[PDB]
Design an enzyme around this catalytic site. Sequence first.
Site, mmCIF file in Angstrom:
data_model
loop_
_atom_site.group_PDB
_atom_site.id
_atom_site.type_symbol
_atom_site.label_atom_id
_atom_site.label_comp_id
_atom_site.label_asym_id
_atom_site.label_seq_id
_atom_site.Cartn_x
_atom_site.Cartn_y
_atom_site.Cartn_z
ATOM 1 N N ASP A 12 14.745 -1.333 3.185
ATOM 2 C CA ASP A 12 15.621 -1.464 4.349
ATOM 3 C C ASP A 12 16.349 -2.810 4.315
ATOM 4 O O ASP A 12 17.512 -2.872 3.919
ATOM 5 C CB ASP A 12 14.820 -1.299 5.643
ATOM 6 C CG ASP A 12 13.517 -2.051 5.619
ATOM 7 O OD1 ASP A 12 12.770 -1.900 4.633
ATOM 8 O OD2 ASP A 12 13.230 -2.784 6.587
ATOM 9 N N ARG A 30 0.838 -1.196 0.000
ATOM 10 C CA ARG A 30 0.000 0.000 0.000
ATOM 11 C C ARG A 30 0.888 1.268 0.000
ATOM 12 O O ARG A 30 0.608 2.261 -0.691
ATOM 13 C CB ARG A 30 -0.850 -0.018 1.274
ATOM 14 C CG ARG A 30 -2.226 0.592 1.182
ATOM 15 C CD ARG A 30 -3.304 -0.482 1.325
ATOM 16 N NE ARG A 30 -3.215 -1.237 2.576
ATOM 17 C CZ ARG A 30 -3.491 -0.752 3.785
ATOM 18 N NH1 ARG A 30 -3.877 0.502 3.937
ATOM 19 N NH2 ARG A 30 -3.397 -1.538 4.848
ATOM 20 N N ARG A 45 -0.555 7.810 6.730
ATOM 21 C CA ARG A 45 -0.296 7.714 5.293
ATOM 22 C C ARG A 45 -0.651 8.995 4.554
ATOM 23 O O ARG A 45 -0.069 9.296 3.510
ATOM 24 C CB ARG A 45 -1.107 6.587 4.653
ATOM 25 C CG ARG A 45 -0.742 5.184 5.059
ATOM 26 C CD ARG A 45 -1.672 4.218 4.361
ATOM 27 N NE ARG A 45 -1.637 2.892 4.970
ATOM 28 C CZ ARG A 45 -0.633 2.027 4.845
ATOM 29 N NH1 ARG A 45 0.442 2.344 4.124
ATOM 30 N NH2 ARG A 45 -0.708 0.838 5.438
ATOM 31 N N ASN A 86 14.912 -7.680 1.417
ATOM 32 C CA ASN A 86 14.356 -8.991 1.109
ATOM 33 C C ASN A 86 13.150 -8.959 0.174
ATOM 34 O O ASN A 86 13.109 -9.690 -0.822
ATOM 35 C CB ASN A 86 13.992 -9.693 2.416
ATOM 36 C CG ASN A 86 15.155 -9.717 3.400
ATOM 37 O OD1 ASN A 86 14.957 -9.727 4.618
ATOM 38 N ND2 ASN A 86 16.377 -9.732 2.873
ATOM 39 N N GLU A 128 8.756 1.707 -5.246
ATOM 40 C CA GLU A 128 8.618 1.364 -3.844
ATOM 41 C C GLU A 128 8.710 2.612 -2.983
ATOM 42 O O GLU A 128 9.281 3.617 -3.392
ATOM 43 C CB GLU A 128 9.714 0.380 -3.451
ATOM 44 C CG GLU A 128 9.718 -0.026 -1.992
ATOM 45 C CD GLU A 128 8.433 -0.716 -1.565
ATOM 46 O OE1 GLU A 128 8.505 -1.577 -0.665
ATOM 47 O OE2 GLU A 128 7.354 -0.395 -2.111
ATOM 48 N N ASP A 129 8.136 2.549 -1.792
ATOM 49 C CA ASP A 129 8.179 3.683 -0.886
ATOM 50 C C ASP A 129 9.468 3.637 -0.071
ATOM 51 O O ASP A 129 10.150 4.656 0.089
ATOM 52 C CB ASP A 129 6.951 3.677 0.033
ATOM 53 C CG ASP A 129 6.813 2.391 0.824
ATOM 54 O OD1 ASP A 129 7.301 1.342 0.353
ATOM 55 O OD2 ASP A 129 6.200 2.423 1.911
ATOM 56 N N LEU A 178 11.876 -6.451 -1.972
ATOM 57 C CA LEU A 178 12.183 -5.999 -3.330
ATOM 58 C C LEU A 178 12.989 -7.086 -4.022
ATOM 59 O O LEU A 178 12.811 -7.351 -5.208
ATOM 60 C CB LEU A 178 13.003 -4.704 -3.316
ATOM 61 C CG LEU A 178 12.264 -3.388 -3.560
ATOM 62 C CD1 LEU A 178 11.535 -3.464 -4.882
ATOM 63 C CD2 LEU A 178 11.283 -3.125 -2.436
HETATM 64 N N1 LIG Z 1 5.506 1.694 8.183
HETATM 65 C C1 LIG Z 1 6.754 1.295 7.906
HETATM 66 N N2 LIG Z 1 6.959 0.210 7.080
HETATM 67 C C2 LIG Z 1 8.313 -0.110 6.877
HETATM 68 C C3 LIG Z 1 9.415 0.585 7.418
HETATM 69 N N3 LIG Z 1 10.615 -0.015 7.000
HETATM 70 C C4 LIG Z 1 10.240 -1.020 6.223
HETATM 71 N N4 LIG Z 1 8.853 -1.167 6.076
HETATM 72 C C5 LIG Z 1 8.106 -2.231 5.243
HETATM 73 O O1 LIG Z 1 9.021 -3.119 4.575
HETATM 74 C C6 LIG Z 1 8.892 -3.081 3.139
HETATM 75 C C7 LIG Z 1 10.213 -3.020 2.438
HETATM 76 O O2 LIG Z 1 10.977 -4.201 2.736
HETATM 77 P P1 LIG Z 1 12.320 -4.655 2.031
HETATM 78 O O3 LIG Z 1 12.257 -4.485 0.570
HETATM 79 O O4 LIG Z 1 13.393 -3.853 2.652
HETATM 80 O O5 LIG Z 1 12.393 -6.054 2.480
HETATM 81 C C8 LIG Z 1 8.094 -1.856 2.828
HETATM 82 O O6 LIG Z 1 7.173 -2.143 1.769
HETATM 83 C C9 LIG Z 1 7.353 -1.566 4.078
HETATM 84 O O7 LIG Z 1 6.015 -2.034 3.992
HETATM 85 C C10 LIG Z 1 9.188 1.730 8.292
HETATM 86 O O8 LIG Z 1 10.038 2.438 8.841
HETATM 87 N N5 LIG Z 1 7.817 2.028 8.482
#
Ligand SMILES: Nc1nc2c(ncn2[C@@H]2O[C@H](COP(=O)(O)O)[C@@H](O)[C@H]2O)c(=O)[nH]1
Lengths: 169, 167, 169, 167
Positions: B94, B43, B156, B97, B90-91, B99
């Site tokens: 971190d 979302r 949001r 995993n 993507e927003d 992506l």
């Molecule tokens: N609300 C929120 N979601 C996060 C945060 N850091 C990571 N996420 C969640 O983790 C996802 C990204 O994960 P990655 O690609 O790093 O595994 C994002 O789509 C998001 O939903 C944060 O600081 N706040």
Amino acid sequence: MKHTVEVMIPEAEIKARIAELGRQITERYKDSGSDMVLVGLLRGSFMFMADLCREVQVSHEVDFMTASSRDLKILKDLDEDIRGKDVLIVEDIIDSGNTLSKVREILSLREPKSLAICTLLDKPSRREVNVPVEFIGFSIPDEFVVGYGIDYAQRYRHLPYIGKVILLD
Amino acid sequence: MKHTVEVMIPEAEIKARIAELGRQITERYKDSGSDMVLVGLLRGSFMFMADLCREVQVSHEVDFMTASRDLKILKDLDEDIRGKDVLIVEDIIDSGNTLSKVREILSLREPKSLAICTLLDKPSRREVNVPVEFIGFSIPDEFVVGYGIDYAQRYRHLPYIGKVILL
Amino acid sequence: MKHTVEVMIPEAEIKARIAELGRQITERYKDSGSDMVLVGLLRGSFMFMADLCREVQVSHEVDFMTASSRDLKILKDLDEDIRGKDVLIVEDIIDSGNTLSKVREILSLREPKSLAICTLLDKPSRREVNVPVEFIGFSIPDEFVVGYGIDYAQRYRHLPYIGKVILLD
Amino acid sequence: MKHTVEVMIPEAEIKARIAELGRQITERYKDSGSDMVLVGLLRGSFMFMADLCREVQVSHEVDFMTASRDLKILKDLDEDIRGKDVLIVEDIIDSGNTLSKVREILSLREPKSLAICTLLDKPSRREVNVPVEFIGFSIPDEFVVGYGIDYAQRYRHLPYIGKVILL
Ligand SMILES: Nc1nc2c(ncn2[C@@H]2O[C@H](COP(=O)(O)O)[C@@H](O)[C@H]2O)c(=O)[nH]1
Ligand SMILES: Nc1nc2c(ncn2[C@@H]2O[C@H](COP(=O)(O)O)[C@@H](O)[C@H]2O)c(=O)[nH]1
């Protein structure tokens, strides 16, 4: 195919209208107290939802739903519950009024504190199923429009303004 | 759970960065010729997507996908990406995993090209090497909300990126 | 349209073959130790899965997945994780070999202990994408078949036997 | 969590009951004329559906749906049920809340007729009045598994209905 697109509703005007809608939505719900959630209908409402929700000065959740546009089926339901909450369905445009109609019925079943619809564009002349639409950005004739989420053969969906598909011959 | 939200990245700074990204992304595909589609991951990226696609000066389609230990497809794309340039929107990234996997999945569909454009990046938390071609902001490991990102399904709608304070 | 259906593979024979498949699947995995899950592809595999899983004398989970039959997309993903587990994709029939092919690629990504396919019917002559199929109930020519999950214009899907669509003129 | 599974309804008894239900359901729609579709609710009813539809002597389609505090559609039908006789196929009904809602949802699509056929019924746990036209077995409030029903994603493959013992 074979056409061009001309600006119909400039980006700056859309912004202004959305700001006004925002004030109205805010006024209408600021005193409710209960939880609020703007439910957008994908794909069409993504951009309108983005701008709109920022103009709503009242804490709320943002969820999306995507229904098949003969039976209206749910391709992706809401992630969050809406029971006992004020729900504001958000669409880019309403014409036949079929989807919004069925979607509204589906959601009322979850017994939310309230249900209303907010659409950027309204095409009155195309209504087939009467459905109450509380907030409307613009009322327009049955024009071939694109942009701001509305597409034409997978195109113009990213236009910051509402365009008119001319169509050469 | 009691907390406070302080501004981290004000609305105007984001607006400016999105504009830059638009230019970059535009310059990168303006000569491809092949069809192009930006894929947002629901979302959290709906807002980032809305503003970004407007700054992309190349005809493209906009689709959305929503993925969740295994990374599963809760809602797949509506469009076929085969032979097209695909920009995953993507927003925030971190761990890397998610992506990482979403990219694998899309790669199977054999698109002309695959890339990622994330608004926020917390490189201090990466646990997976994943190609990220476009980054709006690299940031400290703060708990960010706003501009699509939430906290217990909240915030949001903020037009700026904020950080949760907790106490 | 305008046709009739005649029995090709009687219900009793299907049962017998499934029992045999069951023994084989059981033999192939009884000593694995790790978790096992038979993944069925909707709609087609529901009946075959029902009978088959009962013939598998080795504790396992049963999950379903449904992919669009040009890009292969997931309309409903698995509910349970398959990482580190022995996964046995279950389909009613394999012809072009496209879906099973892509589905297998999708699932390998979740790094399961093993991936194999089990199909009631095999139509070798129609293979377009080579994909390994470990267990096969019957190999048949490119015949117009229905029943046991295989439909013809939303029909015959509930037949307990494999039928042949004749087609009058 | 440690436990035992004892037979509650042996395979042959189910086979026989399904046969009866088939006759009943058949007799009920054999003269409708309109199209018919049995809708199974995943995951638990896949087996019950497989055996039941074979005993239904009337041309019909077979579709599946999978629903989850609010009752949401994780996967809708592939077929339109408007103007058709729809038989919802469920594995078990206790509280009655889920079938209650799923039925409401389908009713909105205006089908020729709507009904429910559940394999098991724990009327001792109903909290919602819901029309159930066909019942295979009414049972004590035991924790049942098998024949599609699970326990921690386990036992769905058993050809009989069992009861978890716990100790
Ligand atoms: N609300 C929120 N979601 C996060 C945060 N850091 C990571 N996420 C969640 O983790 C996802 C990204 O994960 P990655 O690609 O790093 O595994 C994002 O789509 C998001 O939903 C944060 O600081 N706040
Ligand atoms: N495994 C298992 N699931 C149950 C049992 N009783 C109820 N359920 C779940 O509850 C659903 C039916 O809910 P209802 O229609 O009564 O609200 C079933 O689909 C099933 O998934 C039980 O004894 N065992």
